[PDB]
Amino acid sequence: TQLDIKVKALKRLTKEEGYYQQELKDQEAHVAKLKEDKSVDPYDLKKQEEVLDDTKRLLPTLYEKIREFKEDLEQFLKTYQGTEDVSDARSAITSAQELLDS
Amino acid sequence: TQLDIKVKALKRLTKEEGYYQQELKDQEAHVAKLKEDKSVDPYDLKKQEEVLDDTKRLLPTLYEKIREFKEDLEQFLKTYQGTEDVSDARSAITSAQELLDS
């Protein structure tokens, strides 16, 4: 059903954001360790910093799509006359909204 | 040691590529299913295709960094005089090279 497709599209986008946020947190820990050790060569620290920057640039566009996907689902629900239970859809919208606000 | 830092830097990049390659494979499976179903609204399919395209854009820059990190490690080894066992380094270089050649 179209409802099901729109809900899964959003649920899968928010799950991916979580996945990417794990990576980003793990990379920052690694850069923190190198930055704290003054015996580390600035070039080896830079290689790692430049990689973090790349990962980070991914998030902005991801949040742009989470918003579109959320708005799409919300607009679809305002005129929905079907018989399906829309609780999962509402719950998906709330979780996405929480993320955008955080 | 500087050797260990360079080896790890590279090994973590090749492990990241594998992670991102899983995400990509899972997204194409999803888009594939929506593309076969002709009952699906062009816009819902498009939402998914656009996301796939983004995921893909991430790989090229990732391969560029694997090569740079590979070359940095290879260059470091040409003049290495330490006492550490460099088998792990050579092994890291080989896996990275396989990836880039595939």
* Domains of chain B, CATH where assigned: 1-102 (1.20.58.90)
DSSP state string for B82-93: SSS--HHHHHHH
- Gap from A102 CA to chain B (nearest CA, Å): 22
What single letter denotes the amino acid at residue B97?
A: Q
Q: What is the resolution of this structure in A?
A: 2.2
Contact B76, B6 (CB under 8 A): yes
By three-state DSSP, how is residue B47 classified?
helix
For helices B87-101 and B2-36, what crossing angle results, to 10°?
Answer: 30
The rounded distance, in Å, linking the Cα atoms of A54 and B10 is: 16
The closest alpha carbon to A54, from B13, B15, B100, B101, belongs to: B13
Name the experiment that determined this structure: X-ray
How many Å lie between the alpha carbon of A29 and the closest alpha carbon of chain B? Answer: 13
Asked if residue A59 lies in contact with residue A14, where contact means CB atoms within 8 angstroms, the answer is no
- Cα distances (angstroms) measured from residue A56 to each of A34, A75, B9, B32: 18, 30, 18, 29
Angstrom CA distances, B78 to B73, B75, B81, B85, stand at 9, 5, 9, 14
A92: its two tokens: 């998906």
- Chain B positions touching A40 (Cβ under 8 A) are 5
CA A25 – CA A21 distance, rounded (Å): 6
The residue type found at A89 is A
Using alpha carbons, select from A14, A91, A20, A8 the residue that is nearest to residue B30: A8
The candidate with the shortest Cα–Cα distance to A33, out of A22, A19, A49, is A49
Name the token pair of A10.
């959003």
Contact A45, A35 (CB under 8 A): yes
Alpha-carbon distance B8 to nearest alpha carbon in chain A (angstroms)? 11
**Alpha-carbon distances of A36 from A28, B3, B11, rounded to whole Å:** 12, 18, 22
**Look-up: residue for tokens 């799950």?**
A15
Beta strand residue intervals within B11-88, DSSP E: none
List Cβ neighbours of B82 (8 Å cut-off, separation of 6 or more). Answer: B1, B3
Q: Which helix (H) or strand (E) holds B35?
A: helix B2-36
B57-60: long-range contacts (C-beta < 8 A, 24 or more apart)?
A: B58/A58, B58/B20, B59/B17, B59/B20, B59/B21, B59/B24
Whole-angstrom distance, CA of residue A71 vs CA of residue A94: 11
The DSSP letter of residue B38 is: T
Residues from chain B contacting residue A30 (CB–CB below 8 Å): 12
Smallest CA-to-CA distance from B13 within A10, A84, A68, A48 is with: A48
Q: How far is A70 from A99, CA to CA, in rounded Å?
A: 11
At residue A38, the 3 state secondary structure works out as: coil
Element (H, E) at A41: none
Picking from B1, B35, B44 by the largest number of A CB atoms within 10 A of its own CB, the best residue to mutate is: B44
Burial annotation A25-48 (CB, 10 A radius, 16+ → b, else e): eebeeeeeebeeeeeeeeebbebb
Please answer whether residues A59 and A23 qualify as being in contact, where contact means their C-beta atoms are separated by less than 8 angstroms. Answer: no
